[PDB]
């Protein structure tokens, strides 16, 4: 009741980072970022104290296809090792079956990162040609979406990416961003990342709108009383304009 | 086992009467995006249902004097319906008294107005009086302005509440007609504006989204269906079916 909540999280720019500071920093104050700002607001609104812990396996949370066991922050919640996961944890069907998410504090989707000043305006324009290469970070959520879409355009896109995978799937986002900057290439990625990048790379832009729709939510264990309280607090923060301010604080270049 | 009662409201392209030459029966009276959503949810979760239009014709807002809710929100509070499947906006005041699914569609408040004018933002509207503006009575857009501490929107509510018999309209239908026939701008959700402006080509959206929010399925507080419907929505989203439904109804 006066117990501190254990908050699992993971390093991910600009959601959660170690703060650079002149002053000495102790404990939770060693961290900063959008999710840390959100956590601070939630703790004030709902009146809890907390302890931030970085997740032991450096994973968000997936289910093993052979033994059915979870990992990452999702596993910490399932096992009641954490009270909250405050991180850009995507709200998905498979996860929502095993933990309880708040309503989303951010809604987003897959989109396209490309250089400015071209006539390409959609995923369709990319799908119906071969001169401009395009791809994604190998094994990421975005690539996974394409590997599964039965939507026409996206199925064609995956045909291309899969065949030319040694050429167009990259091992990291920075590798991908450099390819967009130095060659005739477009990168499929989450729109939150694209915005972060385009605020810092004035010669790049998002192409088109969103290709899918999904949200990031605060994770709680199934049955947690904090889930609905956090949802109401998030909705109020949104309506008051405060999450929008928080987003601009951490994303603007 | 037993049919659920589903409350909803007439609002195109979400819910509308299906055109026919002879009377249609029961649920077959209706079509639209939300009618298709309801059908898909019923398939995943395995329930039958009877659609009933909300008895008082309202989305739902709190009466300031006695504190009581009306509309679909009140029907859920009083267990007059099991679900509300409708373009029902998820707001923190409503989430305190009913249980929403996670959102099936995102949206934001924006402005519907005639083309070709110098007006480009809520601020332009707030800072003059010639052009009147309003919203649908007892919906979340009205309630956003009524509660807003943001200076521009607080100003707009001052205007609107002063002239509420005038500028607060009974329905989007009435609001659209007012935009078309008088010097009036309608504060309307962006999804609905996108539908309207594809049909009325002398109308346009002014500015961007004022806020960001979603539509959810409403259930009574504590309903077992709330989390089931959330999981079904995520399945439909990830399968691309919500996107296909949006393409069908916003052509
Ligand atoms: O919950 C999750 O699994 C993900 C993890 C993490 C995923 C990144 C994006 N991916 C990182 C990646 F680089 F590995 C590929 C990229 C993508 O798939 O587009 C954005 C912030 C997160 C959002 N939620
Ligand atoms: N979707 C709104 C109604 C429309 C509006 O207020 O603009 C609601 O749930 O109240
Ligand atoms: Cl204690
Ligand atoms: Cl929820
Ligand atoms: Li869940
Ligand atoms: Li609620």
UniProtKB/Swiss-Prot annotation, chain A:
Q: Which domain of life is it from?
A: Eukaryota
- Quote the PTM field: Sumoylation mediates kainate receptor-mediated endocytosis and regulates synaptic transmission. Sumoylation is enhanced by PIAS3 and desumoylated by SENP1.
Subcellular locations according to the entry: Cell membrane; Postsynaptic cell membrane
Positions annotated as glycosylated: 2, 203
Query: What results from changing residue 203 to Q?
Result: Loss of glycosylation
Locate the residues binding L-glutamate: 88, 90, 95, 141-142, 190
Q: In which tissues is it expressed?
A: Highest expression is found in the olfactory lobe, piriform cortex, dentate gyrus, hippocampus, granular cell layer of the cerebellum, and in caudate-putamen.
Q: Which of the residues are on side Extracellular? A: 119-253
Q: Which family does it belong to?
A: Belongs to the glutamate-gated ion channel (TC 1.A.10.1) family. GRIK2 subfamily.
Additional remark text:
The postsynaptic actions of Glu are mediated by a variety of receptors that are named according to their selective agonists. This receptor binds domoate > kainate > quisqualate > glutamate. It does not bind AMPA without coexpression with GRIK5.
- Kindly state the subunit structure of this protein: Homotetramer and heterotetramer with GRIK5. Tetramers may be formed by the dimerization of dimers. Assembles into a kainate-gated homomeric channel that does not bind AMPA. Can form functional heteromeric receptors with GRIK4 and GRIK5. Can form functional heteromeric receptors with GRIK3. Interacts with DLG4. Interacts with NETO2. Interacts (via C-terminus) with KLHL17 (via kelch repeats); the interaction targets GRIK2 for degradation via ubiquitin-proteasome pathway.
Q: What does this protein do?
A: Ionotropic glutamate receptor that functions as a cation-permeable ligand-gated ion channel, gated by L-glutamate and the glutamatergic agonist kainic acid. L-glutamate acts as an excitatory neurotransmitter at many synapses in the central nervous system. Binding of the excitatory neurotransmitter L-glutamate induces a conformation change, leading to the opening of the cation channel, and thereby converts the chemical signal to an electrical impulse. The receptor then desensitizes rapidly and enters a transient inactive state, characterized by the presence of bound agonist.
Q: What is this protein called?
A: Glutamate receptor ionotropic, kainate 2
Q: Which residues of the full protein are shown?
A: 429 to 801 of 908
């Amino acid at each position: 009741s006066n117990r501190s909540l254990i908050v699992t999280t993971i390093l991910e720019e600009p959601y959660v980072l170690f703060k650079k500071s002149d002053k000495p920093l102790y404990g939770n104050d060693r961290f900063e970022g959008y999710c840390i700002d959100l956590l601070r607001e939630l703790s004030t609104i709902l009146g809890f104290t907390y302890e931030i812990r970085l997740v032991e396996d450096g994973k968000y949370g997936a289910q093993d296809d052979v033994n059915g066991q979870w990992n990452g922050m999702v596993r910490e919640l399932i096992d009641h090792k954490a009270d909250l996961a405050v991180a850009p944890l995507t709200i998905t069907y498979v996860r929502e079956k095993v933990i309880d998410f708040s309503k989303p504090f951010m809604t987003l989707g897959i989109s396209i990162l490309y250089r400015k000043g071209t006539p390409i305006d959609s995923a369709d324009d990319l799908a119906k040609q071969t001169k401009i290469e395009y791809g994604a970070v190998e094994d990421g959520s975005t690539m996974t979406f394409f590997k599964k879409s039965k939507i026409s355009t996206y199925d064609k896109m995956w045909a291309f990416m899969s065949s030319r995978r040694q050429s167009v799937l990259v091992k990291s986002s920075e590798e991908g961003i450099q390819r967009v900057l130095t060659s005739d290439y477009a990168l499929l990625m989450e729109s939150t990342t694209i915005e972060f990048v385009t605020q810092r790379n004035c010669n790049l832009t998002q192409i088109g709108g969103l290709i899918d729709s999904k949200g990031y939510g605060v994770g709680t264990p199934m049955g947690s009383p904090y889930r609905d309280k956090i949802t109401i607090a998030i909705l109020q923060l949104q309506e008051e304009g405060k999450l929008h301010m928080m987003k601009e604080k951490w994303w603007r270049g």
